[PDB]
Amino acid sequence: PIGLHVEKFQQTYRKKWRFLTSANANVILAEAASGERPARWALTTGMASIPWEYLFFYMSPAEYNRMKNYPGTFAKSASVRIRTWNTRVATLNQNKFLQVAKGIRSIPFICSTNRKYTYSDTEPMQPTGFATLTSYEYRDGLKIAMYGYDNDSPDFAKKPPADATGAEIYLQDYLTIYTNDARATTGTKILAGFPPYKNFIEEFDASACINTDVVAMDYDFSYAPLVPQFAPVPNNLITQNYNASYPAGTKNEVTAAKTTDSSQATPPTQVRNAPRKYIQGPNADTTFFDEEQNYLRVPIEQGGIFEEVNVETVHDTQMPSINVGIRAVPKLTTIDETTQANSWLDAQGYFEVDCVLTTESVDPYTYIKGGCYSANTKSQLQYFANDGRPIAKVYDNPNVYGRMQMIKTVKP
């Protein structure tokens, strides 16, 4: 027989961006202890982060607002291609080198985070501190640079849309590696210095790399729900059971959350039946999608966070990170008497990024009247905190045992 009527819609979003990186110096910065954050030393790089894990990177505000009209939308794949151009920089015989880090965020023993620095006036290439800009605010400023303001905004003329002009956007969130600050540490100290992150990045002479793919990555999403599924017809209005238990075997079909403690004060634990809420139907909590976290604030893939009422397998996921930059060009001289450079040339990287996102949605017609209804096996759950604030996976924190953590969303 013909069976169920389902309409499948595939959509593709392509963007082309041009980014300028700073080629900062590798300078150790002190960051003071603040609450749970310990005192630590921070070593800066010039390798700017490419926010390819977020939805604004691929699709504009118009495309996002239209996609919000297609329930059941899943991001199926993403792809990013990064090429490099001539590196803008007294001398004429400079040496310039291009640095690429792929998946350095996943490395368990390299504590790293993308940060924005403040720079010296005398040495514009030397970071002297940290700007208060968070990673979300960096992505938001980048989105406003990409797509402009609304026509009624009094600040409209300040940021012409790069999606219209094709102009370059200064890419100002660079990799930073952390180590202990044992100056005030009591008891036994860990004095291991820095990890040799040089051994985990690729470095080329970009003279021969011009207009060639320095980065080429493809990613298939395990579970990236962009719009919640159509709500099923609730069986509690039709059946007496609607609350029945059925025998699970030795298979797990309710996901669990694993909590680890690198302080080793507590052993790792795994807790099943975490607090979570439906994202469609009678008692839906669509706060995540109404606040539009997935567009700019949260990565596309949320594999371990969302759950369906089904026997499918769920597993933890993380997208690899991309950092592209240029090694700082030293200005070192004998009269400086230093073994390491204290002055640098104003180099600048020019990167061209082609990004493609493929998504797919379904319209199921389960009942004769009303509208689209899915099977109740397609009902989706999402982790929630005990304060009602949804939980999402984040990529802008240091990895915990090589894994990306899940935390409460912020926006009210």
Place this chain on the structure above:
Amino acid sequence: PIGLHVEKFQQTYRKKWRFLTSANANVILAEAASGERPARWALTTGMASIPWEYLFFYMSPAEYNRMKNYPGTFAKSASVRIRTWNTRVATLNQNKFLQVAKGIRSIPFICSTNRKYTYSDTEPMQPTGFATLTSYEYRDGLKIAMYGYDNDSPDFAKKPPADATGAEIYLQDYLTIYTNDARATTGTKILAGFPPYKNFIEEFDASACINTDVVAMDYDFSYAPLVPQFAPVPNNLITQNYNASYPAGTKNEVTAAKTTDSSQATPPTQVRNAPRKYIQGPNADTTFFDEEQNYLRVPIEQGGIFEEVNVETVHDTQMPSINVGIRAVPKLTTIDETTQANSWLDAQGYFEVDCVLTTESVDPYTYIKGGCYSANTKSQLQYFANDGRPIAKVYDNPNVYGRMQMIKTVKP
């Protein structure tokens, strides 16, 4: 070396039945709310249920009583073949159509149940309500029709054994599809109508289908314990431990029960270490097998319900449903002025069912004296309720998220 002595016994039970179906009209019936059961609309079909999931369908009271003498009996396979004959029915040029539903019980969005109707006196093919006969009572009446009464029964002459005569049995439990009754519903209503169940059944012209397999299904049981295993020699009489913990890995070897709520008032949960009791040995609770639930009241397969003390994998199971019937023949005429038929011809379906059940049992001789004893790794558990009432899987309830539910047995 020769190892352990085990005797394997394979047995086969074959039955041939002849069934008459009614070919009822498709009439919407109202069923009032009663406790947990909401108000709902019921659409009837003429497709009678074939109880091939139950043990009486394959083996007679004598065979069942003898099988109860073979501990460790598992049903290994079942098979059903359904052929059709001439369809008995002023006019001479009628159109008759044969309807087959395979596995419509498993479909998540079709809320369906096999029900017995009461019919109009003027229109014998038009259901007008629901009989109080439950599915268990329907199967019990069918069993009494198949195998007769006991020779001392005062009602002996009323039901000649169809297993002896070869005569036809009126098969009177037909598929029914439920939808919301939002007439008294407060708040937002679901007005989706009925599912298009026409799109999920096969329909043929049975003129060319005569004496050909309209249905042919085979099923292999994952775990269908018909008689409990031989009790092992209890190691608490021989060893000091008898209560030792040993390290399970990341594998689950204790089954869990999953509870879902289509009302969405509660997220799905999975609970491990459900209340359960041994079915042989020192503290055995053989209430299930002493009350003989598996013969007539409970399906053959109980895959997720029973558990052994072993590392084997357990998974949830369900046998597909079979409904065979004939589309109602309308008696519609211009003077009726109706667009849909309100009068029908007394058609009748004639189906011949050949059913084969293969089972197997083992006699292990673990010790020299006494009798048969199995290895303690063959000890079996069964889910029980907190009131001592065993839990079994049932097929005569609407599916919950496409799964058959487990409930307490009824018989005291």
Place this chain on the structure above:
Amino acid sequence: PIGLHVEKFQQTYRKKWRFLTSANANVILAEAASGERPARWALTTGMASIPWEYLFFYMSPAEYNRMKNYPGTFAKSASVRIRTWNTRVATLNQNKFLQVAKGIRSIPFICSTNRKYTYSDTEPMQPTGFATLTSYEYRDGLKIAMYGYDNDSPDFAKKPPADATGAEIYLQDYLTIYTNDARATTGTKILAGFPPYKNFIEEFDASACINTDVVAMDYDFSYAPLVPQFAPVPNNLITQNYNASYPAGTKNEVTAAKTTDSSQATPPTQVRNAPRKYIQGPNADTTFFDEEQNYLRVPIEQGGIFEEVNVETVHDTQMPSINVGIRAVPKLTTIDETTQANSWLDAQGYFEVDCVLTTESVDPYTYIKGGCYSANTKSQLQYFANDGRPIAKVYDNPNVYGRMQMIKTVKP
């Protein structure tokens, strides 16, 4: 890029032992009830246990003390080859038979344990009771026989090192099979006698077996941590999270302990997040390795006991047992009037054992300074009791449902 610097070190330990077994008679002995231990009948064999599951069997005190200087040492494989020589024994035409039991400890329905007997003065081959020597003390005496005392020991001259001399060691821990003692049992009794353990052992005429491998076994360890890994740099000194939860899927990555009850008073249960402690790092509890349990008191493999903070799969493990011996030579005569022998000849088995153990360790250099540090994904946990006493798997207890149990270690 070059990546992480890790040095891999493979080491091999070979020993050659010569063992003399007694060829005891098969005599039923009574063992009285004592606390949790019930009254039971014990049937003795002459098949001495080969302690190939323990580390002293393969590596000397010097090798053990040196290995303790290689963090991250895992035993990768073990291998044992057992050959037989002429069997020393009025008459000249004796019949001698060689008995081999492989994996009889794993058989669920044979309750067996290796025990030391006391023998009759008139019949040296007839056991008359049980010596108070436990299995640990047997292994300790065997180790002292193998490797001698310390040079300052006043008992130094009593035990010349067999590792130096090549001399034979009397191997005095023989297999014993237990059954019920229902003499004082109230209620229903289990009168099954003994299991036919004859059907589970190999027996040869060792006349043609001389200088040929009677046993040849290889074992690959799933998880046998001999020395704990290098502690990672703790991320709680560098990161704010250090306690973050991340979404496990439907996969289990925290191990669970399964408790069974052959008394059937309680159903089997599985408990996740058992009490356990880190064995390196900030809050390490290295009591197991400081007391040196793995050398002599505990088997090499502890697969289900130790756990890493990772997604790797853990599963329960057990090494097969080896018992080699000689059937007792009867001295039966007509004047005895007995149907079974009550006098025996002083036979003796001569076995030559070649044992090889391969292990491997890693030195990771994660940070620039300090020393070796591993990735925090290599951090190891071990089950602990609520009294702080570590939990290890033991092989010198009867199997519970065919599985080796885990218990608290003893040494303070």
Place this chain on the structure above:
Amino acid sequence: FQQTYRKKWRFLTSANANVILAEAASGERPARWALTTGMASIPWEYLFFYMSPAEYNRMKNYPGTFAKSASVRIRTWNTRVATLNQNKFLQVAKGIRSIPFICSTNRKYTYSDTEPMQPTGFATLTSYEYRDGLKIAMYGYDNDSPDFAKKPPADATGAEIYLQDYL
């Protein structure tokens, strides 16, 4: 047990002028004239050149350790430098220390302010102190050091180290 230690360094040399400097007599050292070169010494004969403090501290746990072999590969890049048509030349000395009649030593100079490429004297830095400063440049300080931020580890950053001990 065989072990291997690999390092990758980037060095900047000064290209000093060939200037005769006077060094006064001091004790056993006679009065002598010193002619400078721009050829910086590569300290490939020392263990810090190949293995980090962590590797050294771990190796101290392996009695009987002998260094079996060493190998060094030196490549050159673009030479940074009014005019546009300069002539630049690369100088390599292999085993000039072994030559009996060439009295040579690797020294650190002090340079003129007006002519940064012209040595004007000798710095008090000895060869051991030069190697120690080079090691601190390569591997950083300890995390408790108050001077930690002054010298980022070149083994981590991959940055260039000014190589300032010339023939």
